[PDB]
Amino acid sequence: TNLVAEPFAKLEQDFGGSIGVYAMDTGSGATVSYRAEERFPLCSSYKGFLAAAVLARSQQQAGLLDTPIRYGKNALVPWSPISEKYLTTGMTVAELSAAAVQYSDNAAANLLLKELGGPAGLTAFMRSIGDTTFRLDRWELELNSAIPGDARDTSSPRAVTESLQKLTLGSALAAPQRQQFVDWLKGNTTGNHRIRAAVPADWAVGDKTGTCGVYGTANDYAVVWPTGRAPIVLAVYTRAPNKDDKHSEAVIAAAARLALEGL
């Protein structure tokens, strides 16, 4: 494991912070692991699991995804580029979930958290699939503070990867909801410079990004479908000790490539 891990150590020294990586090869069971059980801030990456939690509720509540959510102007917060457009009409739960995943829409996320019982409700969903590491404690935008040593609103790369596998590839969700989650992730617009940059253009990728900005804190997790092979699941998380430490998408992409090449 020392030989597998060596390149990540050099990458995080130039980065000036900590990088956490977990990658799983679902064909052979091979893994690559580096700080994989350390906690990192989730930033917006919880919004992928939020959409999976919505899909799980839709299995118990037929038509949930169809229900319109009509909101007032103080639902809007910055980085809500889709929900801002539909203030005067409302949006369906399906549209809000797509926007939260694919545009990281903040007001959309807050509206869906309310539907699920707040951050605690999303955490409870993750516990229901056996993820005992994930915790969402706060709402947008307070959850992005990324203060070093704060355990709130964190998970680990390994827990993120294992929960993503269960929900996209395992049977934690029914097959229609499962494919809907995958399809939302494949349509993400925010991840072109992270894990996707490490993946041949021929291979499908679904991903969800997070960018707290502060404390060098940013991340991405993805499912990758190499042509005619079993899919790979992986997560790359970063943080750094000073508030003005810059995050780096190039570092995330480089760590993804090292994980993928190492399987």
Side-chain angles (χ1 to χ4, degrees), residues 46 48-57 59-60 116 118-132 134 163 166-167 172-173 181:
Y46 75 92
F49 294 118
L50 176 61
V54 170
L55 288 162
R57 293 284 181 104
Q59 301 167 161
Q60 296 175 293
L116 300 177
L122 176 54
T123 297
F125 169 70
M126 297 298 283
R127 295 287 180 274
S128 89
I129 62 166
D131 186 335
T132 59
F134 177 104
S163 297
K166 295 169 173 176
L167 295 164
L173 300 170
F181 186 32

Side-chain angles (χ1 to χ4, degrees), residues 23-26 169 203 222-226 229-234 260 263:
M24 165 61 92
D25 191 322
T26 72
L169 298 178
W203 299 358
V223 183
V224 172
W225 286 266
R229 306 290 186 254
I232 291 99
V233 191
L234 72 166
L260 288 164
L263 288 169

Side-chain angles (χ1 to χ4, degrees), residues 202-220:
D202 276 338
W203 299 358
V205 171
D207 70 305
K208 177 75 197 85
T209 59
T211 314
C212 291
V214 296
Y215 290 101
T217 296
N219 55 57
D220 194 28

